[PDB]
C-alpha cells in the first residue's frame, strides 16, 4: 500500500502495451474537430475565426460554465501558440491580454492570426516565466506543466508552478485558472488544499482532457473539495482502463470570429 489512486493509475498506465495505451488515451473523452481549423491556418486564413490550437475549446468549456469570469487585464503564462490568449480576447469584460511563452527549437512559437479582438493581444516568446517578476493583473492564466512517466517528477514540476504563481496570486487577481498537471499525490493534495484556503477557488476536471494525463484545472469560480475531486478523477481514469473501449464524443470546434476591439 502507500499509493494513492492516482499513483496507482500512473503505474498501470506505464504498464499498458502500445495499443492498449493507444486505444485508452482517448477512450470516452470529448474532442473538438480540428481538421478544418488546421487547413485554414496552414493556408493562412487569419480572419476565418479558426482557433490556433485545442486550448481554445478547453478554456472555452470552462468559461461558458462560469468556472471563471475573465475581465480587465489578463496575463497568460505559457501562451505557446495563443489558444488561451485569442479566446480571452473575445470576452466582453476583458479589455487587454498579455502573453508570455518560451518558444525555441522544441517548443511552440506564438502564432499571429486575427480573430475577434486580436489587436489587444501581445505574445512575447523567449520568456522564462520562472525568472519573470509578477505583475498586478485582473485575471491570471497558467497552462504550464510537461508530462513525465514518473509521478515524482510530475510532482516536482507541478510544485515549481504553484510556487511561481504564488506571487502572481499575491497581486490580488480577481479570477484565475491554473493547470495542475499532477494533483494526485499526497503532498499535492496537501499543497493544493493549503493554497485553496488562502486564494480560494477549486479544482476541476475537463472532459476534453485525454485519459493519459491526470491534469486538473484550479479555477476561481469553483469550490470543489480538494481530496474528493481528485479521487473522483483518479477513479474515473482507472475505470476507463478496465472495461471495454468507448468512442470519442466529437463536437464542433470554437469559432472566434474576427475584427478589432477598442
Ligand atoms: N504504457 C505506455 N504508457 C505511456 C506511453 N506514452 C506515455 N505514457 C504515458 O503518457 C503520459 C503522458 O503522455 P503524453 O505524451 O503527454 O500524451 P499522450 O496521451 O501519450 O499522446 P501521444 O503523444 O500522441 O501518445 C506519460 O507520462 C507517460 O506516463 C506509451 O507509449 N506506453
Ligand atoms: N518555464 C517556462 N516559461 C515560459 N513558458 C514555458 C515554460 N515552460 C514551458 N513553457 C511553454 O508553455 C507552453 C504551455 S502549452 C500552452 C498551450 C496554450 N494554452 C494553447 O492553448 O495553445 C508550452 O508551449 C511551453 O513551450
Curated annotation (Swiss-Prot):
Domain mRNA cap 0-1 NS5-type MT: 1-262
Compartments (UniProt record): Host endoplasmic reticulum membrane; Host nucleus
Positions annotated to bind S-adenosyl-L-methionine: 53, 83-84, 101-102, 107-108, 128-129, 143-144, 217
Active site: 58 (for 2'-o-mtase activity), 143 (for 2'-o-mtase activity), 179 (for 2'-o-mtase activity), 215 (for 2'-o-mtase activity)
Annotated site residues (Essential for 2'-O-methyltransferase and N-7 methyltransferase activity) in this chain: 143
Binding, GTP: 10-16, 146-152, 210-212
Site (mRNA cap binding): 10, 13-14, 16, 21, 25, 147, 210, 212
Membrane topology: Peripheral membrane protein
Modification type Phosphoserine: residues: 53
Site note Essential for 2'-O-methyltransferase activity, residues: 58, 179, 215
Chain positions covered by the region annotation SUMO-interacting motif (SIM): 74-77
Source domain of life: Viruses
Changes after translation: Phosphorylated on serines residues. This phosphorylation may trigger NS5 nuclear localization.
Reaction catalysis annotation: a 5'-end (5'-triphosphoguanosine)-ribonucleoside in mRNA + S-adenosyl-L-methionine = a 5'-end (N(7)-methyl 5'-triphosphoguanosine)-ribonucleoside in mRNA + S-adenosyl-L-homocysteine; a 5'-end (N(7)-methyl 5'-triphosphoguanosine)-ribonucleoside in mRNA + S-adenosyl-L-methionine = a 5'-end (N(7)-methyl 5'-triphosphoguanosine)-(2'-O-methyl-ribonucleoside) in mRNA + S-adenosyl-L-homocysteine + H(+)
Role played: Replicates the viral (+) and (-) RNA genome, and performs the capping of genomes in the cytoplasm. Once sufficient NS5 is expressed, binds to the cap-proximal structure and inhibits further translation of the viral genome. Besides its role in RNA genome replication, also prevents the establishment of a cellular antiviral state by blocking the interferon-alpha/beta (IFN-alpha/beta) signaling pathway.
Quaternary structure and interacting proteins, as annotated: Homodimer. Interacts with host STAT2; this interaction inhibits the phosphorylation of the latter, and, when all viral proteins are present (polyprotein), targets STAT2 for degradation. Interacts with host TBK1 and IKBKE; these interactions lead to the inhibition of the host RIG-I signaling pathway. Interacts with host PAF1 complex; the interaction may prevent the recruitment of the host PAF1 complex to interferon-responsive genes, and thus reduces the immune response. Interacts with serine protease NS3. Interacts with host KPNA2.
Domain notes: Comprises a methyltransferase (MTase) in the N-terminal region and an RNA-dependent RNA polymerase in the C-terminal region.
Protein name per its UniProtKB record: RNA-directed RNA polymerase NS5
Protein source organism: Zika virus (isolate ZIKV/Human/Cambodia/FSS13025/2010)
Classification lineage: Viruses, Riboviria, Orthornavirae, Kitrinoviricota, Flasuviricetes
